[PDB]
């Protein structure tokens, strides 16, 4: 909560993540309570720190982008929950989690297994891909500003780098 | 909701907010509600009623000022939220929340060592007073 955008942090947690199938679900539980309940200017810090969580490759990386982008069960806590209860007012965290993500799937081969291979999640990952259109059709979304996507350069090249993702 | 213009509610809110961490979100979730999602002839009443409430100097004021300008994450707006949101149509709301804003920096002082020794706040309640301006 308090020691991010710190190197040392991450490194603690990546360190501690390893092979620890109890720390990196209390870990992942706290990320994404953080990134549901937390001020849209200090979200990017949460987002980037969960990245790198999910980035270990170690033997649990596939239960990690599990519990990541869809969360414990009948709790309605993770990324495509937070997505889609963003999608109409919040609009800038919902883009953020998105931008994560599209740096998760092009920069993670194991975690585009996941999504070329489940069903539901590329209805999910389709799902926002169009709510991103939509939203962006209709500059550096961290001011915290309206809450209304601002076409920017950010954006344009996520939306373009999501498009290519879909099959 | 319903018995905001009143006297007996304000001081049986500042008697039960005191340092009741829980409840003094409460109050702020309800109130932050109203400010936002409730008709533009009847703020005042509870505008009125935010500032007895940011005003209490106890333990937890600090909070209060701050999930009040912030908003309580995910669920309700905070005074500057609901000003972006009613710029363009029911720029009225968004009038009446200033004044709320104004009467509560020039008369609390924690309030203006919350707006100056925080940027983003700083920032954002600059972008507000030109706004105030190009309308008039």
């Given at each position: 909560?308090?020691?991010?955008?710190?190197?040392e942090?991450?490194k603690?947690?990546?360190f501690?993540?390893?092979?620890?199938?109890?720390?990196?679900?209390?870990?992942?539980?706290e990320?994404?309570?953080?990134?549901a309940?937390?001020?849209?200017?200090?979200?990017?810090?949460?987002?980037?720190?969960l990245?790198?969580?999910?980035?270990?490759?170690d033997?649990w990386?596939?239960?990690?982008?599990?519990?990541?982008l869809?969360?414990i069960?009948?709790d309605r806590?993770g990324?495509?929950?937070?997505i889609?209860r963003s999608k109409n007012?919040?609009?800038?965290?919902?883009?953020?989690?998105?931008?994560?993500?599209?740096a998760?799937?092009?920069?993670?081969?194991?975690?585009?297994?996941?999504?070329?291979?489940n069903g539901?999640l590329k209805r999910?990952?389709?799902?926002?891909?169009?709510?991103?259109?939509?939203?962006?059709?209709?500059?550096?979304?961290?001011?915290?500003?309206?809450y209304?996507?601002?076409?920017?350069?950010s954006?344009r090249?996520?939306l373009?780098?999501?498009?290519e993702?879909?099959?």
């Amino acid at each position: 909560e308090d020691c991010s955008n710190s190197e040392e942090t991450v490194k603690l947690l990546r360190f501690c993540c390893w092979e620890n199938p109890q720390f990196s679900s209390t870990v992942l539980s706290e990320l994404l309570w953080q990134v549901a309940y937390s001020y849209t200017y200090e979200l990017r810090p949460y987002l980037d720190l969960l990245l790198q969580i999910l980035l270990i490759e170690d033997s649990w990386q596939t239960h990690r982008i599990h519990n990541a982008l869809k969360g414990i069960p009948d709790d309605r806590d993770g990324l495509f929950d937070t997505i889609q209860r963003s999608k109409n007012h919040y609009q800038k965290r919902a883009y953020q989690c998105i931008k994560c993500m599209v740096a998760l799937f092009s920069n993670c081969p194991v975690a585009y297994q996941i999504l070329q291979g489940n069903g539901d999640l590329k209805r999910k990952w389709t799902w926002a891909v169009e709510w991103l259109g939509d939203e962006l059709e209709r500059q550096s979304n961290e001011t915290s500003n309206g809450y209304f996507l601002e076409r920017s350069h950010s954006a344009r090249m996520t939306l373009a780098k999501a498009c290519e993702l879909c099959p």
